[PDB]
Design a protein around this nucleic acid. Structure first.
Ligand code: HPA
Ligand code: HPA
Lengths: 338, 338
DNA sequence: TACGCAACCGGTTGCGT
DNA sequence: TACGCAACCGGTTGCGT
């Protein structure tokens, strides 16, 4: 069809091309005509054709886990913003922590020849670890590890441990010593990592956590509900609870409110993430905030660099968590004796 | 590089091709060799090359509004599931109710030659209306109108009005007559349409809504907060409130809980959407459920048809809302006198 | 000066033998 | 029998004049 343009315009296609991409001088008269031709013709230049030659699709691929979850959703929205802002196009792909689906997506992505890859697969078993290496060639950044797990990629690191520690302390310095914890999957960073940041704080203060007091979540509200309830269901119950993430948290508030417990009056809750609506949680949630947006843009940019500046050596940027004080935590028994 | 394969395998590329796409018989010996060549070679066949010839990218484009919002997010997750399941690849693009960004996305999409388009732009002014026609050629379904607004597209319709009516009735039949309403943007379907479904129910019951009692929302929690609060801030206040959507609702619960009002004891709230976590709202939200998942898959399929079965005539499928009874509504003053 | 020739990017496919 | 020739899909670009 570029041919149809050149022809209506009575010029070559090389010409037609150059005008469309402002790539070498062209007479006005000339320029005009092509524009008109492109116009009456209702012309849209194919990018697949163009891509075939130039050797880049100008589109990036997000090999995500799931996309509804507030946490995820929020990052993604970020990343898209950035792609759009720099001409990139986004391919959102969710493997749902499934290898098979992951190999698949990875393969379609390669075939569609994505300029780069953004990886958020939550859990990284050896198998997934290996597959990814099989594509070192396509440039990529893993956005969700605690520390760099491989040399063939870029990594953006969150400091989940120092976030976990932050959560513990606050609890501590506010009067508590009988604390519970609902962590997320241990097979994750935001799971294991947040937990241990928290646990160090406890060891530091000679506070021990009764195992009947730590209940595994999966980052979903329901798991929050079930844990909160299994915790407050006990003879002896804590005065404060540290919840792995905001959504599961919001599920801990429900349960407590269902056994007519009071937050923060009967139980204080500290969450983790600082999702867009935690302030409108009830009560408004106190939690550790993860810079999700800088998490996103910071990832793009590392990619873009590898893409453009053709970098070869892996990089790793750290991002920082921070405390957001709301109204779901209350002083505890030991406040004044400090 | 297909050439490099053919060569290592000592056969033609036509051959190499046919084996890779099981498109005509090939000797085993032959088949094997190519597989081996593809292998040692670590071969990934380009789809852009392939697309160039076959004339289809095998990828669809979502011209969305925003993607963090639970409602949206949930649909999207749906749609992706379906694309993946039928080989399609997804391009998520959010125009944020901005024409300029919309023209842009639309254009990149055309250029990248998407097999079809899924449209969710919330508001459709004449301008946006026109641009879309400029692409009748690319096959598309609008997933968010109340009734079909143009002949050059497919439409999936939700029945927002009969959802709005449902919400009113329940309120009514539960004892209420002093009701308020926080609608979403009137420039939308889920805004205007839900409102009027609701208002008919009221007219039907000689119930009038004091204008100081209807407060505009924007589907965001904060707008929920501000409205709830502007409503209960009055001398004379309603006994029940109908909220345009679940997230704004969850923001209405916060405020009420902040002026120490009681839900549903001091105010009953009926929401709209049935988002994944409304059950874990506090109290667990009573609301009208929109089949979001069937909303998604039902859209794909209309597209896929137009794509595959090359249909030309616009279609329109209707989907149905339904009541989900939770614990945020309580009997009202007139219950027994009915 | 301002522009055109023609080869190539990596696959697919209609005819052949 | 099982397979190869070569033209084409729609652009881009190094040399020319
Ligand atoms: O691994 C995770 N999954 C879901 N939500 C999360 N929020 C923090 N970490 C996670
Ligand atoms: O237009 C809308 N926008 C956001 N959320 C929504 N939920 C229902 N309708 C809408």
């Amino acid at each position: 069809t570029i041919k149809d343009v050149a022809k209506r315009a009575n010029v070559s296609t090389t010409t037609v091309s150059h005008v469309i991409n402002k790539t070498r001088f062209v007479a006005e008269e000339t320029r005009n005509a092509v524009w008109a031709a492109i116009k009456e013709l209702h012309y849209s230049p194919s990018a697949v054709a163009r891509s075939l030659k130039v050797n880049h699709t100008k589109s990036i691929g997000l090999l995500a886990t799931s996309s509804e979850a507030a946490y995820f959703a929020e990052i993604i929205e970020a990343v898209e913003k950035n792609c759009f802002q720099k001409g990139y196009t986004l391919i959102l792909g969710n493997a749902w922590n499934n290898l098979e689906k992951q190999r698949a997506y990875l393969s379609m992505m390669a075939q569609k020849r994505v300029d780069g890859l953004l990886v958020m697969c939550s859990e990284y078993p050896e198998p997934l670890l290996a597959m990814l290496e099989e594509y070192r060639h396509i440039p990529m950044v893993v956005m969700d590890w605690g520390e760099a797990k491989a040399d063939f990629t870029d990594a953006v690191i969150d400091n989940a441990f120092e976030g976990g520690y932050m959560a513990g302390r606050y609890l501590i310095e506010r009067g508590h010593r009988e604390i519970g914890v609902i962590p997320g999957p241990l097979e994750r960073n935001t799971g294991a990592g947040r937990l241990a940041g928290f646990m160090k704080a406890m060891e530091e203060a000679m506070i021990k956590v009764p195992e009947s007091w730590i209940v595994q979540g999966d980052f979903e509200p329901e798991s929050g509900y079930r844990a909160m309830q299994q915790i407050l269901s006990q003879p002896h119950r804590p005065t404060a609870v540290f919840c792995g993430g905001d959504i599961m948290a919001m599920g801990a508030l429900c349960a407590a409110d269902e056994m007519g417990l009071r937050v923060p009056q009967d139980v204080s809750l500290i969450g983790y993430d600082n999702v867009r609506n935690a302030r409108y949680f009830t009560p408004a949630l106190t939690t550790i905030h993860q810079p999700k947006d800088s998490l996103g843009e910071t990832a793009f940019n590392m990619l873009l660099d590898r893409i453009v500046n053709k970098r070869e050596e892996p990089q790793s940027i750290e991002v920082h968590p921070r405390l957001i004080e709301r109204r779901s935590v209350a002083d505890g028994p030991f406040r004044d004796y400090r």
